[PDB]
Design an enzyme around this catalytic site. Structure first.
Site, PDB file in Angstrom:
ATOM      1  N   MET B   1       0.853  -1.222   0.000  1.00 27.36           N
ATOM      2  CA  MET B   1       0.000   0.000   0.000  1.00 27.36           C
ATOM      3  C   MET B   1       0.876   1.255   0.000  1.00 27.36           C
ATOM      4  O   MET B   1       1.900   1.301   0.699  1.00 27.36           O
ATOM      5  CB  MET B   1      -0.950  -0.014   1.205  1.00 27.36           C
ATOM      6  CG  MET B   1      -2.234   0.789   0.979  1.00 27.36           C
ATOM      7  SD  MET B   1      -3.619   0.318   2.051  1.00 27.36           S
ATOM      8  CE  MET B   1      -4.996   0.619   0.932  1.00 27.36           C
ATOM      9  N   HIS B 129      -0.852  -2.102   6.516  1.00 27.49           N
ATOM     10  CA  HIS B 129      -0.119  -0.881   6.247  1.00 27.49           C
ATOM     11  C   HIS B 129       0.087  -0.099   7.505  1.00 27.49           C
ATOM     12  O   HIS B 129       1.165   0.455   7.723  1.00 27.49           O
ATOM     13  CB  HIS B 129      -0.856  -0.048   5.212  1.00 27.49           C
ATOM     14  CG  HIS B 129      -0.165   1.239   4.867  1.00 27.49           C
ATOM     15  ND1 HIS B 129       0.667   1.354   3.813  1.00 27.49           N
ATOM     16  CD2 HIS B 129      -0.205   2.489   5.481  1.00 27.49           C
ATOM     17  CE1 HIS B 129       1.133   2.620   3.751  1.00 27.49           C
ATOM     18  NE2 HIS B 129       0.598   3.311   4.773  1.00 27.49           N
ATOM     19  N   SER B 150     -27.036   6.209  -0.380  1.00 19.34           N
ATOM     20  CA  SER B 150     -27.666   5.712  -1.626  1.00 19.34           C
ATOM     21  C   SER B 150     -27.228   4.287  -1.907  1.00 19.34           C
ATOM     22  O   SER B 150     -27.526   3.397  -1.114  1.00 19.34           O
ATOM     23  CB  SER B 150     -27.369   6.733  -2.733  1.00 19.34           C
ATOM     24  OG  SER B 150     -28.164   6.570  -3.907  1.00 19.34           O
ATOM     25  N   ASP B 230     -36.365  14.167  -1.702  1.00 24.06           N
ATOM     26  CA  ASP B 230     -35.412  13.361  -2.447  1.00 24.06           C
ATOM     27  C   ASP B 230     -36.098  12.897  -3.730  1.00 24.06           C
ATOM     28  O   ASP B 230     -37.111  12.196  -3.659  1.00 24.06           O
ATOM     29  CB  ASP B 230     -34.965  12.160  -1.600  1.00 24.06           C
ATOM     30  CG  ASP B 230     -33.688  11.516  -2.117  1.00 24.06           C
ATOM     31  OD1 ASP B 230     -33.471  11.524  -3.351  1.00 24.06           O
ATOM     32  OD2 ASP B 230     -32.893  10.997  -1.295  1.00 24.06           O
ATOM     33  N   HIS B 265     -31.387  14.645  -1.585  1.00 28.00           N
ATOM     34  CA  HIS B 265     -30.446  13.533  -1.702  1.00 28.00           C
ATOM     35  C   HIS B 265     -29.014  13.961  -1.550  1.00 28.00           C
ATOM     36  O   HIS B 265     -28.117  13.119  -1.477  1.00 28.00           O
ATOM     37  CB  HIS B 265     -30.601  12.901  -3.078  1.00 28.00           C
ATOM     38  CG  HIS B 265     -30.357  13.869  -4.213  1.00 28.00           C
ATOM     39  ND1 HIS B 265     -29.527  13.586  -5.242  1.00 28.00           N
ATOM     40  CD2 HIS B 265     -30.855  15.161  -4.437  1.00 28.00           C
ATOM     41  CE1 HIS B 265     -29.503  14.636  -6.091  1.00 28.00           C
ATOM     42  NE2 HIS B 265     -30.316  15.597  -5.596  1.00 28.00           N
TER      43      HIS B 265
HETATM   44 CU   LIG Z   1       1.748  -0.028   2.674  1.00 25.78          CU
END
Ligand SMILES: [Cu+2]
Ligand SMILES: [Cu+2]
Lengths: 288, 288
Positions: B1, B129, B150, B230, B265
């Site tokens: 990572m 990580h 959503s 919405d 929304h």
């Molecule tokens: Cu890493």
């Protein structure tokens, strides 16, 4: 004015407005957040004017600064004006023209036609908003704060000083302002373009020059935040310049620059310090 | 990572990350906010909230517009903003629209293993990580909460239910979720495209069907907000079908849908209700 769209946010509303502007000769876009106090049943709500930086529209600060939580908490309204005139008929890379009016009244053609952003911001827009909304429920003219980011930070400090003797704004702060555009690369390009090549006509718009002969009174203070990882800091913002400009003047101990570690130019930086500035403006507007 | 950019925000840091995803077999982008608690360095670990975004969005949208960071600092959690698809036509479907499914159809199966990505690969990659500098501050695996907006609100509920026996997530909430994707147009298209037209594969991903035979335990609650302004509500979200699904079920009385008037929304809605959801996740994570 004309209501383009309304949004429920917190206990109040963010309203998108348009109107035909006399200063700019075009249609202008303006956002305003009305706090929960405006919609409470059963004295004037003061207002904060927030000026945006290069490339921004009113939606950017409205969406990414979270002033609205602070507006409800203290009881102020906040206005998000645009950064330039816009439209097919308006003259127009990222740092000049549309999205980049630098809050000046342009004298050079073909900008002079539409680029009267100094008059738009400080003169026309407040009483246009006053006509639309006002029983003065909202104060757009008397008890008013000014703030902003970058080019907006510049516009805020500039407007406050030029109006100080007549007490035009009762409070002033900035996020990462360009304090001295007359001798900085990004500010020289706008000055030359809008005002011409005569550097004397620049002087009236430059905080570092204006401030020296303005008599500071009382406990008035300008609050500035700037981050040490701001990529514009060294070359364009140079906040030092303003601290140097007030040395040996009545303003000496009353310009407070806070350099904060790790923070950059972004709205992550801005939103982090919105609450502290909100507290600052609210005290000055007599809300706490 | 690998670290791509790292802004100071509030008391902590927002880190933009990229890694080679084995389950998507592409490069993937992930934002993570680490609270002030992570950088105060003088016992129990910092828990994580996984926030799933909606159709169209990258991790940047919620990072910038929801203001979770202030809440993460307030209570002491980390928050992860995954992407919504593999990267590298139609907005219902494809990129930014993976629907948090493990696609079985070709050519999608190749890269659209988004269920394994969210629930298996990412938490273990992050763990490797931040706790494979050999010493451990965060919890990406045990004490974890899930939430979303959503399509992301769907994924959160779905993930919470499918992993409920074993309590994969200790907490679950949603903002304007799609609750019954099988019975909804934009859900049926994505389900048909990724899974084919075969319903044993569909029902394994539908919360309204899943919840009926999952034995509710203790005081577990699902918190949902929705606006009545919405535009997607009436046709695609239809949140109250989940109230009907849990009828006569051990889950009855444990699904809390707060319909709030005037909200839409947008992230003006989401950000308004983030402090309440944060408190909710904080109790459930034992932070308060
Ligand atoms: Cu890493
Ligand atoms: Cu009007």
């Amino acid at each position: 004015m004309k209501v383009v769209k309304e949004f429920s946010v917190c206990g109040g509303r963010l309203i998108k407005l348009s109107h035909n502007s006399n200063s700019t000769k075009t249609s202008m876009n303006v956002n305003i957040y009305l706090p929960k106090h405006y919609y409470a049943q059963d004295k004037r709500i003061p207002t904060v004017f927030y000026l945006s930086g290069l490339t921004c529209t009113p939606d950017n600060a409205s969406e990414k600064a979270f002033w609205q939580f602070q507006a409800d908490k203290y009881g102020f309204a906040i206005v998000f004006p645009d950064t330039s005139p816009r439209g097919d008929e308006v003259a127009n890379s990222w740092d000049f023209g549309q999205g980049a009016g630098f809050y000046l009244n342009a004298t050079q053609e073909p900008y002079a036609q539409h680029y009267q952003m100094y008059d738009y911001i400080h003169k026309e827009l407040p009483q246009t908003l006053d006509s639309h909304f006002n029983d003065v429920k909202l104060d757009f003219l008397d008890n008013v704060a000014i703030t902003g980011h970058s080019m907006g930070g510049y516009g805020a400090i500039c407007g406050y000083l030029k109006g100080y003797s007549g007490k035009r704004y009762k409070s002033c702060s900035a996020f990462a302002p360009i304090v001295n555009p007359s001798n900085v690369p990004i500010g020289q390009k706008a000055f030359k373009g809008y005002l011409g090549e005569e550097k004397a006509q620049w002087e009236a718009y430059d905080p570092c020059l204006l401030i020296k002969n303005i008599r500071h009174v009382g406990d008035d203070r300008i609050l500035i935040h700037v981050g040490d990882s701001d990529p514009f800091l060294e070359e364009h913002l140079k906040p030092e310049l303003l601290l140097e400009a007030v040395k040996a003047t009545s303003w000496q101990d009353y310009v407070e620059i806070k350099k904060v570690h790790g923070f950059d130019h972004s709205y992550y930086f801005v939103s982090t310090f919105v609450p502290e500035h909100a507290e600052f403006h609210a005290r000055n507007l007599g809300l706490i």
